[PDB]
Design a binder for this molecule. Structure first.
Ligand SMILES: [Cl-]
Ligand SMILES: [Mg+2]
Lengths: 195, 250, 235, 231, 111, 243, 241, 240, 244
């Protein structure tokens, strides 16, 4: 865990997540997918404490999938994010809190709008045009402040994202073994295989 | 050992009646008459002090009870059941309202809480319903003066004026003739005393009658001075002497 | 009404005695113990021809060395089997060994009387528990909802039990082979069963030291049925 | 009649019918005999079978190295009560390094059976027990009944047709009490005692069950070919 | 602050032959620089031809042995006087020790 | 009706029939007595010898509470044992908190409240015993008798069981003939006689006598059993009086 | 008719178990009386010791609840002692929690509320007793408050309880009609006890020895019971007048 | 807590509360399950005494437990919601721990176990519900159809019906369903299911519901017009 | 013990019916009639007060119609006290959903949960069921305007127009006659009142014996408004339709 990014453009949300899983002085894996599909039009990326991350992601995934079956209806990205926030807000005052930070990228089919939510382990939710967790933000936020425009296409968003990864690969101390990129739009969730 | 009665003692009969509630209402019917009348600038509640023995001091037994500084209550039916309800009603006004909002509850909501308690005795395990009907008179800033009846079922209704217990049927008819929307508080007290004389049989004086009002604020009954916003309780229990004064001009 | 754990004037628990009547209504189950193994067989008894008979699971594995057949309210047996399986595996975890057949049966029978006013009523199912261990060898047990269990050389339970038990009395001897016992279960099942016995409405199983507990295929049982019919016609 | 629905109800004559019905389950049970001398104590039990294909129901249970009982009635209830005795004997050993007195063993069983006869929901135990043991005050024999009543005796018998064996022991009292330092002769007296309760059936090799405890003898049970000596 | 553990010293030694086995231990018991006993045995016959010793903190060692001896007794009661094999004893002792994983028996055990 | 089917139910009389039914079980039991004396109390009981097979002296019915209180009862023997077990718990918690051994009147109420508690609910059965008990404390000797209802009083003499009326009559004579008081050693001898006289109401089976006593002078304020020479002396005294 | 076995309403709105608990009150066949003086409150009760084997000193239906509060019971002794122990605990707890001695009327209310619970809750039976609480309250002065199995309670000028209660009640009623006051206008408690005994003798029509009566007296800061000799002294004073 | 043993044995060896729960199932609207060569079809009756209904929002008779399994029922409607909820929760719980969706047999076994627990638990009555559970196991093309009942017994069926007049429709299916050759196509299976309901229903308007389940989470509910076409076709062939 | 006095509220009859549920429905059949009618542009809730007294305070009274949130209301038929227990639970459930998802609760979800509570009282606990039937009138952005009913059994169903309480048989026949799908709110108001006016056990239908409420999109642009009618407003709507 370490690098998770998010960019909301005109018609989609793009999430980029690092592939490295490191423990000690060993990179144990270089192809790790740090994300779970919560619903057909809602994707959550995650980063934080080992074990907690996946355990939390899969727990949320199960609850959203349960809701979908019960009501035969997909929850809006706003509704899923509020549910997730509340779970983390409970967690922080527990005996052992989930030390997990997340980005929730979703496409609201009723509004026909992409939405990106950034939620930290304390339960601090914000809707943003672009977001990041951990040390990544110290580079990417200023970069996106400069280069981001609200009316960009998905292809323009991917080039904007390439610009972030290049900067992180140049200035970050750790080797994060590239990123898996996923696009969330009106047609659902798909993975970019060549990045 | 332990309470093994975890099941309902009030159940639906084939006809759809809830027997124990009906029987509780029958107990209320046997009880002594009490009444309430709402005026434009106040509310009056009254009842007869049925003395169990002439050696008994009827002053010690209070049928009309303060619940909050602006809310009072009277009953018809089983006295012990009423006494515990007053204890619970006083406490719930604090625990579920005053300790949260820093002010006393409005009449309707306190009535609602008492009603809840009485409903639970109709459905919870190993208990019978309360064998009383309450009349709750009160005032609050946003609703003004109000008068409510609460039955053993937990149902409550707002009244302009009403009566419950022994001679309620005749007493309600009497109140229908006399009640109008322009009644002043003193006029309502007068009518209350007239209505109550019909149901009372023996002696009729300030020592055998218990009567209280929800009227103007009473700064003299507050117990302290210095806070302008605190102006005193609207609930006042009329003295034995004060009742006898109004019985001369009856 | 009356208490669940009440004694009758004769000195029996009403509910336990009534559960025994439910077991008599159940489908037949037969068990035979030999020195070469223990055989377990049951009547499936499908309520309708549309019911897929292979889904009727009245013979059940507890461990590799312990099998089980049931009769009565078979839904009640699920939690008993679950407990038996957990007891067997747990004992292996604690002691690094197979659990004795008798000790397993005793553990199942401890559940039996844990009812009252614990569960609300006794079990409405009897179990035939067959197995093998190193100490006492091949064993067959009859576990009732009274909490009692008897060891048997052979035993029948269910609707045709008293008729089948009288037949097992005459036929059983201490030198029976496994093959002889297989045919004997099929023979006695065919006698007490309402519908005509075949591979689809009757099921065989066995437990041996070498191969453990095995439920027989419908193909294998069919050959034993055909072998049985030929041998009876041969004299 | 109207006062036998549960154990919490007294009859108009002061009887507890559920306790008496539990007592009835013992009379239906197979016969078992208990007797002792000054040096040894012996249990003899007639085991019962369902049919010729079945095994014979085990009647005797070991509680400690110096104590054990025989049962008559509901076997699962004997298992519960014997398990409780095993724990109480074991508690005395671990905590106090002390073998539990046979008298205290009886007192504990009495109090355990009593609680079931005074509370709603539960039921009385449906079994009678004969406890033998050798402790610091020599050989002992107890008779437990599920009413709670425990009784120390020289000899006794419970179960079906137990009156025959009980009469014999009442006659033989003076003889068998002085069988000191001789296990086989004390058993012989017990086997002869249980024989007075037999009808049509006789004592066979897999039918008879004998147990013994004494001065230099731990509680040990004899079944199968080991009891062939005494037939 | 109260320290629940102590060190009672001593040492033990187990050797296995073809048809036999030995378990030896010294009889000295100590605390700090003082001798408590010159003869305090810590190698016990637990029944079923199993000998056991739990050396380190004697209070924990005695507690463990006492619990195992009791485990052997209940194995007989619950499984028709079956002999507890050495491998089965070992596994039983593992569960005794691991049950106190977060407040350990301070002993090195040998059977 | 049906008022007698459930415990804690008042009949139209104002009676608890279940408690009265428990009294019948007490009346069915063997005779037991208590005699208050100068500086203590004496307890005695009838033990029916059902069979020759009963070991003599080894089925003890009188029970000690703490070290200074004796308890004996008639009726359902297990119910009595349950009450004594409670009494011992009550006495232990009293001594734990207050240091001093429990006074007899204090102890009497502890049993009284516990027995009374078993008449308040239909989920429990009343006690099927009347319990005679007492001992010596700081204020001297006390004798009590407790019944299934929870009712108890102090007594000069007490008796319960099948031969209670015979024993009561004999007790009333002792109170009349000894106004200044009866000694401890005398009370043991009289106790033996009264059990033998009360045995006439249970004379099918012969019996075994059992006596205990607390006395400030004779037993130093502690509860002891009467055994050996003193027991045989009391038996001989009783044998001489019946003939 | 299971509505007569537990405390639930009958078709006519009655609680039969409560009514039958009232009848248990008279099972002892004892009459009690309570009156107030200027400085004191006196309670008297009949004492009947039928059995000769009883220790008469232990036979009592008057209880010292607290230093200031006394209580006489009309009803069976087990329920009487049950109520007494609970009142003693409640009085003690009150003092600890609120820092002053529990008033007689407050204790009466508390015990009445407890009694009320038994009339509403099914698993608990009513106690078959009537509790008469007496004290000299530091605010209200001489006080008599009485509780019953219904959960009813009230203050009294004077009161009586028992089988022949009505005869005693009217006897006292006629005296207070004549005297025109709420109490016994008397300085010493000794003469208030004499009044109580005298009017009980007149109402019941029986004479009393020292062992036929039981007396409790409440003064400021203490309640106490009289011995046989204290009563005998009191009986002599009545006889010589 | 309320402890009463409501489900208990009677002298003849019957548990009347379980048997009376079966009567509640017999009162319920008819439900039918027929499995073909490559599909399963769940047909359901809807009583026509209720007009002025809102069929958009009214609870559907067939419920999805997961994307690949469905549950229909006969009996008390309120009771069925509790079983469906528990089953849906267990379906997600199974995916979470085993990383694989439930088999139809496993899901049935769970639901059946819940029903059984309510026949020997204190303070509760049995579920007045029988269920038909149908679907396809993960990565499997073999059709599955199971039945459960209040007692807790469950079993697999080539075709089965439950509810009111179920004995009539079971009679129909017993002669019309061939084991050697089940309905080869979707149309054949739906037609046989509709035919079987037309023996009992009344009219083929808004009284019949049909749900078709195919492999790999392919579930679709038929509309009024689609079902009405089968009704029109069957009646014309009948007049012969 | 206590077994003697247990009514066994959660058992089946030999016919497979729940005794207490059936008897609770019998209780509800004597309660004041409540009608719900759903139109294309709104919902009407109408309810008849139980035999009014002239001295009853009418304006500051609430017996039949209760507000669950800004978008959902209920009409009650049965024990008012029982209904208030369930109403406060439903009010809380709606706020829990809003707190969790930052969205107003869908109507069906609220109905299902309230119905599941009622179901529980028929299957376990040994308590009597709630003697209450609800008509739920509400709006959400999924299904729009919705009418539901629930009863003591815990079974709920959706409706275009429905009645509960007294004379439902007669009331449902009249609604089934005059109702149509393209109906407006103002027409539904008239139908509701006309139906009550014919099915009423009273001599004549008056303002003081009625509670009335509408749920329209009659607010300003794409938003829902709840209107609990005042006494004078009921008086005016009764004259306007020509009943008085
Ligand atoms: Cl209180
Ligand atoms: Mg943040």
């Amino acid at each position: 865990m370490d690098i998770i990014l998010g960019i909301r453009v005109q018609d989609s949300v793009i999430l980029a997540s690092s592939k490295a899983v490191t423990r000690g002085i060993s990179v144990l894996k270089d192809s790790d997918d740090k994300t779970r599909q919560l619903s057909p039009h809602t994707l959550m990326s995650f980063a934080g404490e080992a074990g907690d991350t996946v355990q939390f992601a899969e727990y949320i995934q199960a609850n959203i999938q349960l809701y979908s079956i019960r009501e035969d209806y997909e929850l809006s990205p706003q509704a899923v994010s509020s549910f997730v926030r509340q779970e983390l807000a409970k967690s922080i005052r527990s005996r052992r809190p989930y030390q997990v930070n997340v980005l929730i990228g979703g496409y609201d089919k009723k509004k026909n709008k992409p939405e990106l939510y950034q939620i930290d382990y304390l339960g601090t939710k914000v809707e943003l045009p672009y977001g990041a967790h951990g040390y990544s933000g110290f580079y990417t936020f200023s970069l996106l402040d400069h280069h981001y425009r609200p009316d960009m296409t998905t292809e323009e968003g991917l080039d904007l994202l390439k610009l972030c990864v290049q900067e992180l690969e140049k200035r970050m101390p750790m080797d994060f073994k590239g990123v898996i990129v996923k696009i969330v739009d009106k047609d659902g969730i798909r993975q970019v295989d060549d990045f | 050992m332990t309470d093994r009665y975890s099941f309902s003692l009030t159940t639906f009969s084939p006809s759809g009646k809830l027997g124990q509630i009906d029987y509780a209402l029958t107990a209320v019917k046997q009880g002594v008459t009490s009444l309430g009348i709402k005026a434009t600038n106040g509310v009056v509640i009254a009842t007869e002090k049925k003395s169990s023995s002439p050696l008994a001091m009827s002053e010690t037994l209070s049928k009309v009870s303060l619940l909050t500084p602006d809310i009072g209550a009277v009953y018809s039916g089983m006295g012990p059941d009423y006494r515990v309800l007053v204890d619970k009603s006083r406490k719930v006004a604090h625990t579920s309202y005053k300790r949260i909002y820093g002010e006393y509850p409005p009449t309707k909501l306190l009535v609602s809480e008492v009603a809840k308690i009485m409903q639970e005795a109709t459905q919870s395990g190993g208990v019978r319903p309360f064998g009383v009907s309450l009349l709750i008179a009160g005032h609050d800033e946003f609703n003004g003066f109000s008068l409510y009846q609460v039955d053993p079922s937990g149902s409550y209704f707002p009244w302009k004026a009403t009566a419950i217990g022994k001679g309620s049927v005749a007493a309600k008819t009497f109140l229908e003739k006399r009640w109008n929307d322009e009644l002043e508080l003193e006029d309502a007290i007068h009518i209350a005393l007239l209505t109550l004389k019909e149901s009372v049989e023996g002696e009729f004086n300030g020592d055998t009658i218990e009567l209280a009002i929800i009227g103007d604020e009473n700064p003299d009954l507050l117990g302290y001075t210095g806070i302008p916003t605190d102006k005193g309780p609207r609930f006042r229990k009329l003295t034995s002497q004060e009742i006898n004064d109004r019985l001369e001009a009856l | 009404d009356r208490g669940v754990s009440t004694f009758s004037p004769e000195g029996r628990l009403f509910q336990v005695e009534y559960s025994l009547e439910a077991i008599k209504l159940g489908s037949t189950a037969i068990g035979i113990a030999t020195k070469e193994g223990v055989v377990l067989g049951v009547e499936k008894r499908a309520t309708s021809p549309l019911l897929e008979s292979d889904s009727i699971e009245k013979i059940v594995e507890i461990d590799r060395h312990i099998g089980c057949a049931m009769s009565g309210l078979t839904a009640d047996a699920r939690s008993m089997i679950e407990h038996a399986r957990t007891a067997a595996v747990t004992h292996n975890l604690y002691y690094d060994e197979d659990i004795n057949v008798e000790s397993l049966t005793q553990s199942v029978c401890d559940l039996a009387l844990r009812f009252g006013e614990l569960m609300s009523r006794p079990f409405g199912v009897a179990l035939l528990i067959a197995g093998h261990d190193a100490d006492d060898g091949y064993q067959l047990f009859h576990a009732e909802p009274s909490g009692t269990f008897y060891r048997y050389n052979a035993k029948a339970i269910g609707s045709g039990s008293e008729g089948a038990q009288a037949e097992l009395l005459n036929e059983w001897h201490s030198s029976l082979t496994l093959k002889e016992a297989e045919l004997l279960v099929l023979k006695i099942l065919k006698q007490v069963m309402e519908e005509k016995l075949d591979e689809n409405n009757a099921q065989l199983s066995c437990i041996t030291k070498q191969d453990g507990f095995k439920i027989y295929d419908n193909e294998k049982t069919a050959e034993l049925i055909k072998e049985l019919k030929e041998k009876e016609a041969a004299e | 009649n109207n006062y036998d629905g549960d154990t919490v109800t007294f009859s108009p004559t002061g009887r507890l019918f559920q306790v008496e019905y539990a007592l009835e389950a013992i009379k239906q049970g197979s016969v078992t005999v208990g007797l002792r001398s000054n040096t040894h104590a012996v249990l003899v039990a007639l085991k019962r079978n369902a049919d010729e294909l079945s095994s014979y129901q085990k009647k005797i249970i070991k509680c400690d190295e110096h104590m054990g009982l025989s049962l008559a009635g509901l076997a699962p209830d004997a298992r519960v009560l014997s398990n409780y005795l095993r724990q109480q004997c074991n508690y005395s050993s671990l905590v106090f390094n002390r073998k539990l007195a046979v008298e205290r063993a009886g007192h504990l069983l009495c109090d355990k059976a009593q609680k079931n006869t005074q509370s709603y929901g539960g039921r009385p135990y449906g079994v009678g027990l004969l406890i033998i043991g050798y402790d610091k005050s020599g050989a002992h024999l107890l008779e437990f009944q599920p009413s709670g009543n425990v009784t120390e005796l020289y000899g006794t018998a419970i179960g079906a047709r137990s009156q025959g064996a009980k009469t014999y022991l009442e006659r033989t009292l003076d003889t068998f009490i002085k069988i000191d330092g001789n296990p086989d002769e004390l058993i012989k007296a017990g086997v002869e005692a249980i024989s007075q309760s037999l009808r049509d059936e006789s004592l066979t090799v897999d039918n008879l069950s004998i147990a013994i405890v004494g001065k230099d003898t731990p509680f040990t049970i004899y079944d199968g070919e080991a009891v062939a000596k005494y037939i | 602050q109260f320290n629940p553990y102590g060190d009672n010293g001593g040492t033990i030694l187990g050797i296995a032959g073809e048809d036999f086995a030995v378990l030896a231990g010294d009889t000295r018991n100590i605390t700090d620089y003082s001798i408590n006993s010159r003869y305090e045995p810590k190698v016990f016959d637990c029944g079923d031809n199993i000998v056991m010793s739990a050396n380190g903190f004697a209070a924990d060692g005695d507690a463990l042995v006492k619990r195992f001896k009791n485990s052997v007794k209940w194995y007989h009661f619950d499984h028709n006087d079956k002999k507890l094999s050495i491998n089965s004893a070992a596994r039983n002792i593992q569960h005794l020790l691991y049950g106190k994983r977060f407040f350990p028996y301070y002993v090195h055990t040998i059977i | 009706t049906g008022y007698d089917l459930s415990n804690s139910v008042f009949s139209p009389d104002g009676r608890n029939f279940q408690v009265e039914y428990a009294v019948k079980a007490v009346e069915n039991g063997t005779t037991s007595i208590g005699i208050k004396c100068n500086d203590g109390v004496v307890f005695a009981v009838e033990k029916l010898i059902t069979s020759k097979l009963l070991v003599p002296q080894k089925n003890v019915k009188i029970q000690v509470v703490d070290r200074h209180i004796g308890c004996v009862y008639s009726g359902l023997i297990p119910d009595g044992r349950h009450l004594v077990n409670r009494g011992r718990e009550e006495a232990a918690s009293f001594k734990k908190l207050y240091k001093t051994p429990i006074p007899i009147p204090a102890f009497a109420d502890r049993l009284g409240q516990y027995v009374q508690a078993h008449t308040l609910y239909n989920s429990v059965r009343p006690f099927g015993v009347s319990t005679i008990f007492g001992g010596v404390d700081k204020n001297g000797a006390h004798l009590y008798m407790l019944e299934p209802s929870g009712s108890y009083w102090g007594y000069k003499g007490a008796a319960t069981g099948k031969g209670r009326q015979s024993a009561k009559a004999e007790l009333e004579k002792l109170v009349d003939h000894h106004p200044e008081g009866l000694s401890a050693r005398e009370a043991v001898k009289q106790a033996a006689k009264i059990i033998y006289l009360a045995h006439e109401d249970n004379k099918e089976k012969d019996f075994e006598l059992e006596i205990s006593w607390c006395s400030l002078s004779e037993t130093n304020g502690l509860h002891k059993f009467v055994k050996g020479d003193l027991l045989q002396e009391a038996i001989d005294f009783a044998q001489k009086e019946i003939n | 008719g299971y509505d007569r076995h537990i405390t639930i309403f009958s078709p006519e709105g009655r609680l039969y178990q409560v009514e039958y608990a009232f009848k248990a009150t008279n099972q002892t066949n004892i009459n009690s009386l309570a009156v107030r003086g200027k400085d004191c409150t006196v309670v008297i009760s009949q004492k009947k010791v039928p059995d000769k084997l009883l220790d008469p000193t232990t036979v009592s239906y008057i209880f010292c609840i607290s230093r200031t509060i006394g209580m006489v019971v009309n009803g069976p002794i087990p329920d009487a002692r049950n109520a007494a122990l609970r009142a003693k605990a409640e009085a003690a707890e009150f003092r600890y929690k609120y820092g002053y001695d529990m008033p007689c009327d407050v204790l009466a209310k508390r015990m009445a509320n407890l009694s009320q619970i038994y009339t509403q809750r099914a698993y608990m039976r009513p106690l078959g007793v009537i509790l008469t609480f007496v004290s000299v309250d530091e605010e209200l002065g001489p006080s008599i408050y009485k509780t019953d199995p219904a959960g009813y309670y009230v203050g009294y000028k004077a009161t009586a309880t028992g089988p022949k209660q009505q005869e005693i009640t009217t006897n006292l009623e006629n005296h207070f009609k004549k005297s025109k006051i709420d109490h016994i206008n008397e300085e010493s408690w000794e003469k208030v006890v004499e009044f109580a005994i005298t009017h009980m003798i007149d109402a019941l029509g029986t004479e009393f020895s020292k062992n036929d009566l039981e007396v409790g007296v409440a003064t400021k800061d203490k309640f106490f019971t009289l011995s046989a000799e204290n009563i005998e002294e009191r009986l002599v004073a009545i006889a010589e007048q | 807590g309320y402890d009463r043993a409501l489900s208990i044995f009677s002298p003849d060896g019957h548990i009347f509360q379980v048997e009376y729960a079966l009567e509640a199932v017999k009162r319920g609207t008819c439900a039918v399950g027929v499995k073909g060569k490559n599909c399963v079809v769940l047909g359901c009756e809807r009583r026509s005494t209720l007009k002025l209904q809102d069929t958009r929002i009214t609870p559907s008779k067939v419920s999805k437990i997961d994307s690949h399994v469905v549950l229909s029922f006969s009996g008390l409607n309120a009771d069925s919601r509790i079983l469906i909820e528990k089953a849906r929760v267990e379906a997600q719980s199974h995916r979470l721990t085993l990383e694989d969706p439930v088999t139809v047999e496993y899901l049935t076994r769970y639901v059946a176990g819940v029903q059984q627990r309510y026949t020997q638990s204190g303070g509760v009555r049995p579920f007045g519900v029988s269920t038909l559970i149908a679907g396809f196991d993960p990565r499997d093309d073999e059709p599955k159809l199971y039945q459960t009942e209040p007692s807790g017994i469950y079993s697999s069926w080539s075709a089965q019906t439950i509810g009111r007049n179920s004995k009539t429709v079971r009679e129909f299916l017993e002669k019309n369903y061939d084991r050697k050759e089940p309905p080869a196509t979707v149309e054949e299976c739906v037609k046989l299911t509709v035919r079987s309901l037309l023996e009992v229903v009344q009219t083929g308007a808004k009284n019949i519901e049909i749900t078709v389940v195919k492999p790999d989470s392919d579930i679709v509910a038929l509309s009024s017009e689609e079902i009405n076409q089968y009704v029109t076709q069957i009646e014309q062939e009948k007049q012969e | 013990g206590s077994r003697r006095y247990d009514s066994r509220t959660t058992i089946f009859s030999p016919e497979g019916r729940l005794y207490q549920v059936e008897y609770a429905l019998e209780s509800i059949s004597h309660a004041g009639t409540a009608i719900g009618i759903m139109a294309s542009d709104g919902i009407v809730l109408a309810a008849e007060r139980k035999v009014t007294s002239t001295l009853l305070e009418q304006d500051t009274s609430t017996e039949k119609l209760y507000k669950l949130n800004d978008k959902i209301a209920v009409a009650v038929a049965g024990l008012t006290a029982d209904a208030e227990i369930l109403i406060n639970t439903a009010r809380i459930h709606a706020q829990n959903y809003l707190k969790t998802y930052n969205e107003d609760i869908p109507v069906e979800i609220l109905v299902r949960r309230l119905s599941d509570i009622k179901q529980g009282y028929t299957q376990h606990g040994g308590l009597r069921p709630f003697g209450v039937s609800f008509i739920y009138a509400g709006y959400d952005d999924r299904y729009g305007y919705q009418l539901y009913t629930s009863n003591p059994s815990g079974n709920y169903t959706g409706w275009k127009a429905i009645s509960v309480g007294a004379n439902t048989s007669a009331a449902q026949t009249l609604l089934q006659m005059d109702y149509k799908d393209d109906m407006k709110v103002d027409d539904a108001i008239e139908l509701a009142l006309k139906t009550l006016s014919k099915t009423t056990d009273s001599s004549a239908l008056t303002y003081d014996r009625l509670e009335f409420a509408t749920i329209r999109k009659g607010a300003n642009d794409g938003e829902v408004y709840q209107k609990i009618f005042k006494p004078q407003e009921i008086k005016d709507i009764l004259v306007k339709t020509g009943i008085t």
